[PDB]
Amino acid sequence: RFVSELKLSKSKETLARKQTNFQEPCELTCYSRVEGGEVIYDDQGLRLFKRHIGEEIGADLNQGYDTFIEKKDLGSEGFGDLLGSIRAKNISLDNIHFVTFRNNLNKILGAAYNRHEPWEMGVHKRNGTIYLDVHKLPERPQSDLDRRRCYWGYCFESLATEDPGRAYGEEIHHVDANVEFCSVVRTKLGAHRVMMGAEMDCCDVSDKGKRFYVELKTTRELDDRTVDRFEREKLLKFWIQSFVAGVPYIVVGFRDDGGRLVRTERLTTRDIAHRARLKNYWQGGVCLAFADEVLCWLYGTVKENEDYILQFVHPFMRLELLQAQSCPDAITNHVHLL
């Protein structure tokens, strides 16, 4: 059942000196999951950023919690939508090395520094393309308080975006976490071409007419006991996620323990990595060099028509590739339709 491992052997100093090519990400298509659950291969669902979000300081992020519609775990069925959109737009996978939700790339890049948060994904090579399938590890069921905390983030996204149907002084209500927009993005890390689905929070448009995505995050306001993890861990995760999909801006809402919005930051993805490198908190290049080793190892080791699990678990000294017992139907069906 153990197939191969990759040891976190190289020092960061090794990797920090290493230059890794990364193709500027390019959107090829997109899709929207609308209320009720229908997926449409267009941008209906893409929200516009509210530039004056900074004027909403004091907002109660609890507003509308009692009419919130919580998100459904769809699994590899959700991956079927991404794959469907790729087929529909005539994006050729013939020489694409990896196809995945962005979530799995976040995990691979993050493993250069992450030594506490385990993960697993499915690995399924078909017709020369490795499909990475998100796996959720077993977790205790969420309490209402946990749900309320997650809702504060959804509430912030609604506050930070334009809604033409929202009347003057109208509160946020009937937020539905099942409505989402996904960008299907092309890139290449080192020698390996990648197609990914990236869930995008909203967009804005430049003075010169260019559309770009903005990521919207919510987190607890900082204190002496939490600031280190924010600088070293949270901001690294935010940078990874935006960088790999070519997202240039991240707007962060800071909330208190009651759910009131107390502060906002409008960050530039490039600037986050710049500050971190100067402070020697972390280096983006280390993540890219590490990820390049991972993808090389996978493409070198993963067999055509096989099913594996790739995991990163305690003690976080190696990635482990294990033999798996099945393949998601979303993937099988996609391959048949090709």
The strand pairing partners of 193, in sequence order, are: 188
Question: Residue 328 in 3-state DSSP?
Answer: coil
The answer on whether 101 is annotated among ligand-binding residues is: yes
Q: Which of 334, 270, 281, 314 has the alpha carbon at shortest distance from 131?
A: 334
**End-to-end CA distance of the chain, in Å?**
30
- 8 Å CB contact between 116 and 314: no
The answer on whether 102 is annotated among ligand-binding residues is: yes
Question: Residue 273 in 3-state DSSP?
Answer: helix
Question: Residue 311 in 3-state DSSP?
Answer: strand
Place of tokens 């903005």: 214
Q: Which two tokens stand for residue 232?
A: 């070293």
Total tally of structural domains belonging to the chain: 1
| Distance in angstroms (rounded) separating the CA atoms of residues 221 and 223 | 7
Place of tokens 């004091």: 58
- Which of the 8 DSSP states describes residue 325? S
The answer on whether 157 is annotated among ligand-binding residues is: yes
Place of tokens 């990236």: 198
| Distance in angstroms (rounded) separating the CA atoms of residues 277 and 281 | 6
- Say which residues have a Cβ less than 8 Å from residue 333's Cβ, sequence separation at least 6: 80
| Distance in angstroms (rounded) separating the CA atoms of residues 78 and 199 | 12
Q: Which two tokens stand for residue 246?
A: 């070519």
Range of the domain at 334: 1-338
Q: Which of 146, 141, 148 has the alpha carbon at shortest distance from 175?
A: 148
- 8 Å CB contact between 266 and 251: yes
Number of other residues whose CB lies within 10 A of the CB of residue 310: 27
The answer on whether 199 is annotated among ligand-binding residues is: yes
| Helix, strand, coil percentages, rounded to 5, for the chain | 30, 30, 40
Question: Taking the mean position of all CA atoms in its chain, how far away is CA 266?
Answer: 19
What b-and-e string marks burial along 56-92, b requiring 16 or more CB atoms within 10 Å of the CB?
A: eeebbbbbbbeebeeeeeeebebbbbbbbbbeeeeee
The answer on whether 56 is annotated among ligand-binding residues is: no
Q: Where are the beta strands (DSSP E) in 139-210?
A: 180-189, 192-199, 202-205
Amino acid in the structure at residue 276: A
The answer on whether 201 is annotated among ligand-binding residues is: yes
What b-and-e string marks burial along 179-207, b requiring 16 or more CB atoms within 10 Å of the CB?
A: bbbbbbbbbbbbebbbbbbbebbbbbeee
- 8 Å CB contact between 310 and 121: yes
Residue 246: CA count within 13 A, CB half-sphere: 19
